[PDB]
Amino acid sequence: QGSYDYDLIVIGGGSAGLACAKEAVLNGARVACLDFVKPTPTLGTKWGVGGTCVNVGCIPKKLMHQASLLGEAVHEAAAYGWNVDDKIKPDWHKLVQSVQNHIKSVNWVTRVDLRDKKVEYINGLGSFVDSHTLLAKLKSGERTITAQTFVIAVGGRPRYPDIPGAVEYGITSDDLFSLDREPGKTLVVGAGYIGLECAGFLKGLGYEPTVMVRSIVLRGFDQQMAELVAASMEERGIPFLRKTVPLSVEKQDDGKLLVKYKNVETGEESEDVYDTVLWAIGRKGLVDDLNLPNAGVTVQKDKIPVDSQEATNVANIYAVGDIIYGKPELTPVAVLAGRLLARRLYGGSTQRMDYKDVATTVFTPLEYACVGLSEEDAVKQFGADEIEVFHGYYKPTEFFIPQKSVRYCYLKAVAERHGDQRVYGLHYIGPVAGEVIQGFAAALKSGLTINTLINTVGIHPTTAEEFTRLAITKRSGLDPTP
Amino acid sequence: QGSYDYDLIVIGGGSAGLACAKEAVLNGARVACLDFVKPTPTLGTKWGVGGTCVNVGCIPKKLMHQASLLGEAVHEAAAYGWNVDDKIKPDWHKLVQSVQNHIKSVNWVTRVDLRDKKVEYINGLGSFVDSHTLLAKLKSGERTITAQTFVIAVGGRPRYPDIPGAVEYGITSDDLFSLDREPGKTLVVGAGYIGLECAGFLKGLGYEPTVMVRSIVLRGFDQQMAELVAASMEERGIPFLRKTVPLSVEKQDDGKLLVKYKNVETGEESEDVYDTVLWAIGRKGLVDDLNLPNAGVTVQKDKIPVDSQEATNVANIYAVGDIIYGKPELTPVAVLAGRLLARRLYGGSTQRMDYKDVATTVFTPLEYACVGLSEEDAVKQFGADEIEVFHGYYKPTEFFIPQKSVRYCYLKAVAERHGDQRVYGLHYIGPVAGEVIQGFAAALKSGLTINTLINTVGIHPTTAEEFTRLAITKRSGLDPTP
Numbered sequence A, B: 001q002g003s004y005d006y007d008l009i010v011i012g013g014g015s016a017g018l019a020c021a022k023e024a025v026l027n028g029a030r031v032a033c034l035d036f037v038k039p040t041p042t043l044g045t046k047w048g049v050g051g052t053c054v055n056v057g058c059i060p061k062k063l064m065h066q067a068s069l070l071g072e073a074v075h076e077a078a079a080y081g082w083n084v085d086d087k088i089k090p091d092w093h094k095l096v097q098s099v100q101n102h103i104k105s106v107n108w109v110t111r112v113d114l115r116d117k118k119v120e121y122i123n124g125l126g127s128f129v130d131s132h133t134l135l136a137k138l139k140s141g142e143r144t145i146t147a148q149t150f151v152i153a154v155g156g157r158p159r160y161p162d163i164p165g166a167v168e169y170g171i172t173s174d175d176l177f178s179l180d181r182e183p184g185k186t187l188v189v190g191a192g193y194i195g196l197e198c199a200g201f202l203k204g205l206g207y208e209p210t211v212m213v214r215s216i217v218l219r220g221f222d223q224q225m226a227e228l229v230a231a232s233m234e235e236r237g238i239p240f241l242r243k244t245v246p247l248s249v250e251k252q253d254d255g256k257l258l259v260k261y262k263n264v265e266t267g268e269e270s271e272d273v274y275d276t277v278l279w280a281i282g283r284k285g286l287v288d289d290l291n292l293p294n295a296g297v298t299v300q301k302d303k304i305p306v307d308s309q310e311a312t313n314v315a316n317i318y319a320v321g322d323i324i325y326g327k328p329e330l331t332p333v334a335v336l337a338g339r340l341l342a343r344r345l346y347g348g349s350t351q352r353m354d355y356k357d358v359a360t361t362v363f364t365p366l367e368y369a370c371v372g373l374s375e376e377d378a379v380k381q382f383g384a385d386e387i388e389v390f391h392g393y394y395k396p397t398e399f400f401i402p403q404k405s406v407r408y409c410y411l412k413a414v415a416e417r418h419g420d421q422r423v424y425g426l427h428y429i430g431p432v433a434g435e436v437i438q439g440f441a442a443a444l445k446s447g448l449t450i451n452t453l454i455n456t457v458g459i460h461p462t463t464a465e466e467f468t469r470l471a472i473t474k475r476s477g478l479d480p481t482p
Ligand SMILES: Cc1cc2nc3c(=O)[nH]c(=O)nc-3n(C[C@H](O)[C@H](O)[C@H](O)COP(=O)(O)OP(=O)(O)OC[C@H]3O[C@@H](n4cnc5c(N)ncnc54)[C@H](O)[C@@H]3O)c2cc1C
Pocket: A011, A012, A013, A014, A015, A016, A017, A034, A035, A036, A037, A038, A050, A051, A052, A053, A056, A057, A058, A061, A124, A125, A126, A127, A153, A154, A155, A156, A173, A194, A286, A289, A290, A320, A321, A322, A323, A329, A330, A331, A332, A334, B459, B460, B461
């Protein structure tokens, strides 16, 4: 009660913003949704509607990971009697065209879907004038629009190190999936899931990545599982530069990139030449252009703190997805929080988003999926002596004939030691990690216990059945290799 | 412990028998385990210890399915820009050799493990003298041993139709996996999972199968899903002879096999020529050679009815696995039941086998996995108006670039309509169906409801997350294709 141009304005058109805008209209709101994509500096990469996942995230990364797995499949096929040739090579440019052809088909479908659902899509950059007023800057011109409620869904963009040559000579994941030039010998700075997945499918597509790690691999993940993923990448011939930080990048006369770098423990300074330098050193939330102080919204560095209803400290302004402080930065999380948020606003729902036990997958050459607590978090939370860890190495049926290493085929269930022996966390390295873990995440939400887990009849022959076969505890001290 | 040569004699060295034998010795019993493999009649195929799964079942079937899938991966790789050659053909002799090579390694490790664990392995055919005495026929002489307790775990062997030429010219799954000659053009008589799987990998390896179906496809399975499986195989060039039954087989001068057959609906008589006739029309329990009347054990046709502790009507004699009457005939069922039985006999356990909601996968070219009730059984049991079926067609991310048909990529959830909305059944046709369904099967055993299902965050991008995206009910009559 007051009267504005819209019930709801959503700022940002990626996973959360669009899910939110669509669910809001379904429930009868009058809604606008702004989306705009700043081109990468140098290179100037830009793209269509639908945000990070579709354009420069989950989707192209999965497709290139598939490109890399298919190469290996071609190699294994010979072991099974197929008369395949060995000297096979990927055309990078055909790969990139395929992937970009897919993404642009998706951009169109999404654009049509919005218009069909009557979501008013504005292609401009929104900034607050006040807690109820937004200026949209359009390709040419501006509109000032009001709303009862604002959902901030602006996400982030890749960070650049504060080092000479960084922006002129390096790229990020924004550039990588449409790179005009072949990656070639590549330096991947950062050992979060993005850097690892990148290095992984670079090696698999015939290039030469090296991963540079400042301190640890996959911070926020179970560190045993982390180190197993890193060693499995080294087994695949991907070198790692541990405890090492970039100093500078310069272009040589021959067009090669000379990177000087520094070991952070020893102080040792080194250099090497690469064709490509990929920064995968984190993503910074896009609060900057919002002019949040005009709106009264408090900020926590580059992110926005929200209550369990995704409200900011300003009662009418909400934020959802990646710009939000301290929550899983993942697509299905953005989508579902976006939608639920529209449903409480307009569909009379009280269902709040559940952020606990979110499953995830790192799509490394051998993939790592997990849901729930890491081993160390459970131990910190409850005490070593109130925790049980069941573990083992296993052998995929599909690995024997081609003789593929099973050295890093390992899984573990982290659980309550007594009582109901509640399962806290599940971790798996191996083929189709995410396909395996998804149903187990649903089980953890239904209260999975160790007794149920271990008495769920296996589907044979699968690697998923290895979770139901778990029996050796770390406490027993018994060899986890059957 | 007192009077007999053994605490325990296990008759049958397959999935149930070995799991029973091993667990029994772990709990201090003195055990022998008999295994003997009768050679196939004609042809005379025979193999080592470990039973059907290892030698003529799950394992070779999974390996040849993998060979067929790798063939498809090779063709897909090109869509992603790999410069692979199109004209590839598998070598059957090389494939059989790699499969048999794996199975002989496993036979030997299994034998070694039995000795290491002190299970006394006797390669001889057991028949009862009385309820405490067994005669063992060895290659050499005969033994005659006594025990306090017997576990019958003899399983089954494929059936032959009672039809001229059947045994002289036909083969079964027992011969297939080490066929000396190339299948060629093959009539697969029977449309259970064994027939369909064999037909599927044979087509995938360059041969020309035809499936002959007496009545229905996949009797015992959700029939909607059965028809989608059949049609996905017709999509791949595999024909079905519907409502059709074999009459005879003869060998022509040119070495081919003339099959006379009859449509049982129209009465039509037809014939055709094949290189191979695979009978996949069921398996008969091996009660015959046991001389059960000597033990006083009651049988139910070819099977043995047992109570919920796997006991026969003779209290010192149990049966477990495929020979048992009326239970799922699958490897992990046999393994877990034989384990739990030994653990109750000797381990002071009271835990009984749970035969309900066992998950299974049909490893057809597009795999069908399921757990819990088919739609028709849920409707039968509860009423249409108490059932909600959530369903959808979906598109695997990996299918886009090579433009693979998504026509049969379909899943559904059969659920309680009101109340807690307990999930009764899950069904999925698509890639890595068994990897997807396994965790969901543990979810079901934990009480998975629709609310849990639909609010478990997806792992993106996966096909497994399609389960958590389910939203369109059959009752709405809305299009299940987004
Ligand atoms: C390489 C990489 C791999 C990933 N892999 C996975 C994975 O496999 N699985 C998974 O779940 N997640 C993955 N993610 C994470 C996932 O893509 C993000 O979690 C998700 O896209 C976040 O959605 P969002 O709506 O918050 O932000 P975004 O999708 O980034 O959308 C925000 C949109 O708003 C625009 N915008 C910003 N400011 C304004 C403004 N002032 N006005 C108008 N528009 C604005 C932005 O330009 C952008 O288009 C990956 C991310 C990266 C980069």
